[PDB]
Amino acid sequence: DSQKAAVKAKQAADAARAAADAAQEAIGSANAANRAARRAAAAAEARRHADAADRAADRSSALAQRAATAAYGARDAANSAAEHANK
């Protein structure tokens, strides 16, 4: 269960890292949308970037949900390990 917790914790870390990267994807697209908007002031491009940022947001959210799930798994494994240690 300790090794399980380590694995599930690793999965949480991997999903969390991926979520951080997804945030950077959304940010990069948002910055691109801003530059396109400045050029427009280009509209089609800014909208495409906004859609890409929105997709990145969905990826980040899903990854955060997976990270939380993996963390819950690690917590349950830790709880079982604690019970086993107590026994």
């Binding site: 959304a26 940010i27 948002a30 949308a33 970037h49 947001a57």
Partner: peptide, 9 residues
Amino acid sequence: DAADRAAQD
């Protein structure tokens, strides 16, 4: 937040 800002742009 970035997606919402991107939409605003």
